[PDB]
Amino acid sequence: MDIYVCTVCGYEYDPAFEDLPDDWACPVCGASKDAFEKQ
């Protein structure tokens, strides 16, 4: 739909940004933004 909830810690993020570099890491688990997927 439009949500990027980490699948490691279960963080919550919304796809309403503008500058999304090519290297975002969870500000909690620290894991890469690869385990992130609609949830």
Curated annotation (Swiss-Prot):
The keyword Iron applies. GO terms for molecular function: electron transfer activity; iron ion binding. The keyword Kinase does not apply. Its cofactor is Fe(3+). One of its GO terms (cellular component) is cytoplasm. Binds 1 Fe(3+) ion per subunit. Its main location: cytoplasm. Residues 1-39 form the Rubredoxin-like domain. It is found in: Cytoplasm. InterPro entries: Rubredoxin, Rubredoxin-like_dom, Rubredoxin_dom, Rubredoxin_ET, Rubredoxin_Fe_BS. Fe cation binds at C6, C9, C26, C29. The modification N-formylmethionine is found at M1. One of its GO terms (biological process) is alkane catabolic process. Keywords: Cytoplasm, Electron transport, Formylation, Iron, Metal-binding, Transport. Rubredoxin is a small nonheme, iron protein lacking acid-labile sulfide. Its single Fe, chelated to 4 Cys, functions as an electron acceptor and may also stabilize the conformation of the molecule. Electron acceptor for cytoplasmic lactate dehydrogenase. Belongs to the rubredoxin family. This is Rubredoxin. It comes from Megalodesulfovibrio gigas.
